Amino acid sequence: VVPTVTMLGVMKSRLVGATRGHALLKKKSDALTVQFRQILKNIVTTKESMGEVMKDSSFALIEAKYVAGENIKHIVLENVQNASIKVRSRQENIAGVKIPKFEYFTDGETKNDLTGLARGGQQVQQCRAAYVKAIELLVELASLQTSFLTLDEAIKTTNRRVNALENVVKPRLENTITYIKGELDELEREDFFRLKKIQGYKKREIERQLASS
């Protein structure tokens, strides 16, 4: 870019703004990383639900098999009284990230039931009780994925600003400072020095001419 005092001021302002924006983006990325760590911890904690509720559902299934032998299956698939599975979605916002929220049958709205099997009460209390845990796990996984993507984007932007933009601007500021002070200021003194030399030469010539008379 062309070096000038106004250009130097503009470059300094751009560097200051870049530093401020980098700090703000680092803060946002840190907050998003904290939220992602919390979501990962929650998912790890709720992973054990997928084992506990599964064991309970297995026990209920064994009890139902011992009660009525082979389930009807086929047309109605049997094995349950609840869980008319229908899923509804919601969008929450955390640190500017649109974290989805999930609700479904036996874990929210859109649920219905009718009759059931012999142990259908037990099956609902164990096999259909895992529905809430599954919905929570799905919501946690979706939130973790969204947070990971947002954190990756923010970290890429922050790293680019720290490495490329600021280190691009600062050499430009140094070159602009050098071009002005290193050349224009030096030339101004040299021009004036040569002018003073011309004046001194004129005075000396006048004095010598007067003395020769």
């Binding site: 890429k156 932007t157 680019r160 490329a164 933009l165």
Partner: protein, 207 residues
């Protein structure tokens, strides 16, 4: 210090017609010609239009195509320096392709080898025609491949199924002109025909 704001350079460029500017970065990367294709310029391209026409009608157009490819490569590099190699359009990927080839196989010259000490003009013409033909065939495949996935995303597949012709394109610069003018022109023509047939068949196979 390399700055082109020096009084000598400014006064020279105020009157010189053709200007082969050089970049220190390319010299650092052992490029050798070191001619920065983005800043250099030549006002004499207008006068030599008659010579180009009586030589080859293709060159006047493939030159513009190559210049456009270079400008697009510069813009893409500027974008990817911060966005990242992902999320690039397959057309943009095909543009960066053969732009790498033009950089490392056409503009680059060793200048201390039996092959790159001298280079006849029409040899460079055939090199440019081959590179532009590769670019045009790739973008023709991108335009229509019996589906968007089969049209443009297939560059990775091309990199393998067409790898031999790509290697021959990048290695066609290694042949010394002292090996006989008809020999080199025949080799260039054969390479062009082989690449054309292979890529046309591949674009006409499964799509």
């Amino acid at each position: 210090g390399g700055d082109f704001s020096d009084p000598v350079t400014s006064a020279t460029l105020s009157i010189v017609q053709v200007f082969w500017g050089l970049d220190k970065k390319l010299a650092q990367r052992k490029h050798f010609p070191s001619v920065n294709w983005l800043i250099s310029y030549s006002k004499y391209s207008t006068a030599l239009e008659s010579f180009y026409e009586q030589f080859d009608p293709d060159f006047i157009n493939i030159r513009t195509k190559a210049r456009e490819v270079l400008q697009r490569e510069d813009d893409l590099n500027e974008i990817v320096q911060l966005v990242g190699k992902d999320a690039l359009a397959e057309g943009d990927k095909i543009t960066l392709e053969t732009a790498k080839l033009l950089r490392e196989d056409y503009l680059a010259q060793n200048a201390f080898t039996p092959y790159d000490k001298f280079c006849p003009f029409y040899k460079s013409v055939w090199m440019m025609r081959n590179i532009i033909h590769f670019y045009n065939l790739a973008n023709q495949a991108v335009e229509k491949g019996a589906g968007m996935d089969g049209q443009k995303i297939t560059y990775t597949l091309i990199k393998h199924r067409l790898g031999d012709l790509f290697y021959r394109l990048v290695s066609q610069k290694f042949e010394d002109p002292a090996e006989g003018e008809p020999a080199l022109v025949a080799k260039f023509k054969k390479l062009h025909e082989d690449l054309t047939a292979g890529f046309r068949a591949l674009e006409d196979e499964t799509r």
